[PDB]
Amino acid sequence: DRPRFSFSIAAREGKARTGTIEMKRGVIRTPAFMPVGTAAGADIILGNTYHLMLRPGAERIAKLGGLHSFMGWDRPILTDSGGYQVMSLSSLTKQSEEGVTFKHMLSPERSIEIQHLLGSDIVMAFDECTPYPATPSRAASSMERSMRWAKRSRDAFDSRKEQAENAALFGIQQGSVFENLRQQSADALAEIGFDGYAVGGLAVGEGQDEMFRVLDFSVPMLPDDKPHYLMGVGKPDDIVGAVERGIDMFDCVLPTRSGRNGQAFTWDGPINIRNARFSEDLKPLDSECHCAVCQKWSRAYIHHLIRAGEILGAMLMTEHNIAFYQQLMQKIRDSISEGRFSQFAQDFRARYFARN
Amino acid sequence: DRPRFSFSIAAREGKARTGTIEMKRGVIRTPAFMPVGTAAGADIILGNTYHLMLRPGAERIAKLGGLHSFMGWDRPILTDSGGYQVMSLSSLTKQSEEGVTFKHMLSPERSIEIQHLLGSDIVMAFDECTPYPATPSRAASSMERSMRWAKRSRDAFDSRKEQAENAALFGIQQGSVFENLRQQSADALAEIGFDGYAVGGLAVGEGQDEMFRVLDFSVPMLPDDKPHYLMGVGKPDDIVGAVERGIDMFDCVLPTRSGRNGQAFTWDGPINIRNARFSEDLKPLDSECHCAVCQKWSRAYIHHLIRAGEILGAMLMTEHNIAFYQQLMQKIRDSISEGRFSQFAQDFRARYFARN
Ligand SMILES: CNc1nc2c(CCNCC3CCCCC3)c3nc(N)[nH]c(=O)c3cc2[nH]1
Ligand SMILES: CNc1nc2c(CCNCC3CCCCC3)c3nc(N)[nH]c(=O)c3cc2[nH]1
Ligand SMILES: [Cl-]
Ligand SMILES: [Cl-]
Ligand SMILES: [Zn+2]
Ligand SMILES: [Zn+2]
């Protein structure tokens, strides 16, 4: 019988690690890419707390048996805490020390309760994703509030027996791009104690060079023996560089969003399949990809379907993109385990950026 | 080695028949539902001559290896002759005895050549689908032109060795709702000689009662020993009643169109899955359906996906609808073979129209 939560590192190369998270509903191989569940293999998928709390509502999801039953997925599910999406998507918001009001209220306690009603396995603390750019004062005030909310999240989670005994709780580091604030945030989170630690507040417009610079000093501040989750990242090259900096877990809408917008990921970089240059291209989307789409259909046919407005085209693109992301993660895990990840990262970038 | 074309009737009940068409690329069980190939099991799929001749063009499809290679489908493909869709979809049309000009030209010879370049297995004669309603004079003139075009189609097909030796050609009966014109058309087509015979000019706004009345006298005019194809039909109850009147083959965009618009077919009638009454319905789309969607997901989840704008929702609906149509055809074939089709049709209508 698997434990509630146990992270084991099987191999390391530089700052990169590969290993497993064991939870009651399954094993998660790391570094992991965690796709959105409504996309269409992955070891864990993401639910959408913000959407679900509005439609059909968390109480209704619980009445229907929880998100595992609802979605037909019996393996682990991660949910975000909802505030990032409230601040990005809601029409109007009112923030206070209690939480955020929007047009519904979200507080640390209500976020944890919603995630309990959804039945997710990995629960995120309720935080504030500081906008970018931020002044040091504003980043500090925001981070300090997030740390108070992290403690409230911890307490709310621990009060719900079924959740405390069967799920896991991750804290989210904030502090914008400021090393001293990232350190204070890491210290506060470690004092509270979490099952895993996310790097929040990145992929918010700062660009890859700055994101990597912040990761360079921020990831080592987190406990080494627990998973490190970079929220909202990212493109394939973002993922590779983040793994080189000690990240174990990723989520991003990009493979699914790109698939619905004509973009396919390949080892030679992204391609826009709608472009006329693919109308007679008999090669698969990627000539090394092992996915079911690339085993059967050509770029020319997928181009044709997309240009015709056929939903099948976008679904084939999405299936390929999700599978490409999983193959990327598998190659990352294998190369770290074999001590050739540095070489893999160099080879990957040389080919991905050549765009051949 | 299968023949170019051989239709065998295994069992009959009233006017209904069940049997098989053998062709080089496979066996087609009849009565057959023939879905569009770009939809997502069927024994034959439809290509889209009208679309393909415009994008990417028939010559380009041939350069890519033909429609079987292009679509990844090695079994039989039927193509229509393109004029029905030209008259329904084209912005402007100019008709003459030579053919139709539109904004490209289509004639019997060019239609057959396009279908040859696409590589389809069942080729339709190039006809004129008479608008409804039509006066007797207009229906007669139109039918007479279609019969001259049927002879030109026959000759063009016979001139192309690869096509004549490996594909089959169906003639299309016209004559609107007029028994004498339907008879003249059947006589003309039988004198030319075709591998199968379609009933054209129906499902054009006349409604089911009138369509069935025309089928009552029109199907017996066709050769009994060859397949009978009702073009563009239809809803499940249309199909059942048409089989009761001697039809062997059907095509319709309805299962695919309905799937992209929130409508699912069930043995209790169609349902609009977007309706709020399905938001908490844990039953599958249909509680007897054996499709992969109904084995795994609830109405509530599919409702959720569709309402969220997720492409996955429409694809699950389409997969279910296509599978439902195939299960309908299987039940039809089994019931005719077992001598219980009359009872099946009665039971089907009682439950389908009760809408429970
Ligand atoms: C895209 N950039 C980005 N995303 C961040 C996210 C959200 C991660 N993705 C969530 C999924 C989105 C699709 C639906 C399901 C949930 C962040 N979330 C939190 N709580 N805090 C961040 O600082 C935080 C920071 C993030 N940066
Ligand atoms: C919907 N009603 C209807 N359709 C008819 C059709 C078209 C059948 N469906 C073709 C497919 C449509 C989707 C794309 C692939 C081809 C008819 N075609 C011809 N040639 N003649 C008819 O009298 C004729 C009559 C028809 N009546
Ligand atoms: Cl969320
Ligand atoms: Cl057509
Ligand atoms: Zn692929
Ligand atoms: Zn089904």
Swiss-Prot record, chains A, B:
Result of altering residue 127 to A: Abolishes catalytic activity
Necessary cofactors: Zn(2+)
Keywords assigned: Glycosyltransferase, Metal-binding, Queuosine biosynthesis, Transferase, tRNA processing, Zinc
InterPro entries hit by this protein: ArchSynthase1/Queuine_TRR, TGT, TGT-like_sf, tRNA_ribo_trans-like
Sites where the protein binds Zn(2+): 289, 291, 294, 320
Superkingdom of source: Bacteria
A GO-annotated cellular component: cytosol
Gene Ontology process terms (BP): queuosine biosynthetic process; tRNA wobble guanine modification; tRNA-guanine transglycosylation
Effect of residue 81 to A: Strongly reduces activity
Binding site for substrate: 80-84, 127, 174, 201
UniProt catalytic activity: 7-aminomethyl-7-carbaguanine + guanosine(34) in tRNA = 7-aminomethyl-7-carbaguanosine(34) in tRNA + guanine
Enzyme class: transferase
Pfam family, one: TGT
Entry similarity comment: Belongs to the queuine tRNA-ribosyltransferase family.
Role summary: Catalyzes the base-exchange of a guanine (G) residue with the queuine precursor 7-aminomethyl-7-deazaguanine (PreQ1) at position 34 (anticodon wobble position) in tRNAs with GU(N) anticodons (tRNA-Asp, -Asn, -His and -Tyr). Catalysis occurs through a double-displacement mechanism. The nucleophile active site attacks the C1' of nucleotide 34 to detach the guanine base from the RNA, forming a covalent enzyme-RNA intermediate. The proton acceptor active site deprotonates the incoming PreQ1, allowing a nucleophilic attack on the C1' of the ribose to form the product.
Protein name: Queuine tRNA-ribosyltransferase
Organism ancestry: Bacteria, Pseudomonadati, Pseudomonadota, Alphaproteobacteria, Sphingomonadales
